[PDB]
Design a protein around this ligand. Sequence first.
Ligand code: SAH
Length: 327
Amino acid sequence: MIEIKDKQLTGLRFIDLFAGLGGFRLALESCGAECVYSNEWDKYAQEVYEMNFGEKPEGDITQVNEKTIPDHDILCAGFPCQAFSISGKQKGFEDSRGTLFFDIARIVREKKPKVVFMANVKNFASHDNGNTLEVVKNTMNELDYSFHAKVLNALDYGIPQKRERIYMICFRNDLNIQNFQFPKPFELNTFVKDLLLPDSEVEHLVIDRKDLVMTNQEIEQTTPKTVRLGIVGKGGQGERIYSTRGIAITLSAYGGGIFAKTGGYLVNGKTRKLHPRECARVMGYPDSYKVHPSTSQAYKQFGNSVVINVLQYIAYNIGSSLNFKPY
DNA sequence: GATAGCGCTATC
DNA sequence: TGATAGCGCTATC
Ligand SMILES: Nc1ncnc2c1ncn2[C@@H]1O[C@H](CSCC[C@H](N)C(=O)O)[C@@H](O)[C@H]1O
């Protein structure tokens, strides 16, 4: 994550729904905002959350009375995406884990925050011929909020990861906000290898399969893109080796393959998956962040989390707009 | 809970 | 296309 000297969000209080690791909290807190409520039902995520913020999020949101939610200016939510990802069986709202957005809708209806900050996967914008995004636009417009939506790639904001996500920002109409903009991308000067840990600490992650087929030459010069070098087995998800000289592929939460949830990388002549901490760095988390003791769970948590840096630039721009109030 | 083969989708 | 990539799915122990 980045350091922020002008706390555009000072004095403002927010809600951390579908918290997970608390990526949103880190981002809004670095801008001066105050977290007044957090919600996350996964036992393990809850443990990491406490392990890093002292508190334990509330259980199943679908069964929490919105009236209960503390007043807040900004509502943060990176709701479930298994139901909309390019990787899943796109059952959208028909999927049990696909209706959570409507829970946000009722939270908003009751609490009417000044801003609604949401995030989901890219395939979300086009899912079901775009009808899914439309339901969210109209549902938000019908609650009387503007709807600013856009897809950004982390590689465009200082983090070497091809993670492309859609960010939805909603302001309450009454407060006429018309200068809000998404962060302009800027050159990527950081690559996978710049974030790796010393070999002595990742020896155990080294994999060595006889079906390893290097199909491409290691790259000398760095690029702001993922560059496949080889493959293992059939080369499906988690069976592809990439260059640490390029950027990292999208981390996943339920992903499989020998290099499950992180992908394979070629480091000093060896083939291995990323270390939970390297994942953290890939997601923009400060090394001071305590990861969960269970690696499988840690990989999962970082897998469906958010890139703090990106979240920061948006959060900063949310404050810039909220603060511009001339006479 | 942890591990890992997959198998289909979207993009251009 | 043909090649690449995905907050995934789920069977097994
Ligand atoms: N009904 C429900 N109540 C609370 N959390 C839920 C939920 N259904 C799904 N979730 C949680 O939704 C989260 C989606 S992942 C969101 C990650 C988050 N922005 C971060 O930075 O970590 C998961 O952690 C999942 O456990």
